[PDB]
Design a protein around this nucleic acid. Sequence first.
RNA 1: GACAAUUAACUAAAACCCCUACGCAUUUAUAUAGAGGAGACAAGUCGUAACAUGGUAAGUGUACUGGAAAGUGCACUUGGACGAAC
Length: 328
Amino acid sequence: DSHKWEAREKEHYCLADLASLMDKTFERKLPVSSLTISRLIDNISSREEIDHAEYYLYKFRHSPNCWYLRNWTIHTWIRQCLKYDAQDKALYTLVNKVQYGIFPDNFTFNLLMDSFIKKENYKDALSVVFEVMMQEAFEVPSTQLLSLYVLFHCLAKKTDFSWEEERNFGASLLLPGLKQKNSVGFSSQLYGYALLGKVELQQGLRAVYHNMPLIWKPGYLDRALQVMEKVAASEALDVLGAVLKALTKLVEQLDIEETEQSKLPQYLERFKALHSKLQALGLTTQLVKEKLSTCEAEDIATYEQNLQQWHLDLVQLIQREQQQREQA
RNA sequence: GACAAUUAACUAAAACCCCUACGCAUUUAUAUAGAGGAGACAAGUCGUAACAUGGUAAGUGUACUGGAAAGUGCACUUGGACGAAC
Ligand SMILES: [Mg+2]
Ligand SMILES: [Mg+2]
Ligand SMILES: [Mg+2]
Ligand SMILES: [Mg+2]
């Protein structure tokens, strides 16, 4: 899928007149273009020019041009990063991202990420799955390969996983729970409300909405009990964390609605009251390999109208600088 | 008397920055080597200028002169007189 955008509609092939000129407007504090940076990102050919586009993508965010870092500016930093090693830096720019700022929720996430299975990347792609969750996303079909990835190392670690990592799995299983094609789209989200549910009782309800966007209401375990009832319209772990509360700071609630360190019985008895019928009416990681095999027709159609739309965003973003050196 | 008159711009924006006046100059006041005036009065001195026709009627203007009041010329004044029939 490399050979579809790289007809770049040829421009100049130097950087050292240009990664100089991107600083002499920054000694005088003057804003720069969206298109002096694009000519700098389109001249990476080594590991060092990754850095010279990295130290200079530091300074476009911290500039008068806070925006006007295009979508096609972003991906030509990615699409030119996966040439050499594709190991650390494009992972790093979403690790920091606050002085780097890409937020690529398009098929441009997919082009970096689907390369990472070829090097299998368990401890490297451990974090980008956590840190593509730092944006709200998922009208594109990349919801499946995400939850295909998270169940690969979920069974690998059987711990509390961190002070913070367990609630990230819940957000990396709840907000990916838009796969309504099967009972899996409600039984994955069954687990998604589940492992948010324990920690607030252990730690406090403020831990849910600390950095990533989930709602703040004490109803999370209840929402499973309303989507355990959506599989009844048409799995072992949730017993054991629940009984753990049945076994041996800023407050935001009022008083006839009691706290959920006093809501032990109805959280237990209702979990059996349909489990008795869940066995009456009608494994996790193997089937999504078939959901890899059966779904995802690989809609490159939205990519290829975008590259022409990037070409529709291309010329009129330079021919503005065509008049500006013939009207003087 | 100066300078600035630029980039950047699917949201719009960031950047803008000079200076030369003051000197025992300019204006009034205080202080003074020295010179001069006016006023006052515990007692001097030289005259006798004025007040009576003040012993040359007094005075004004002005000039000249003299220890000092003053003197005199020239022209005015009565704020002097001429004694009021012959
Ligand atoms: Mg006499
Ligand atoms: Mg006489
Ligand atoms: Mg004589
Ligand atoms: Mg004579």
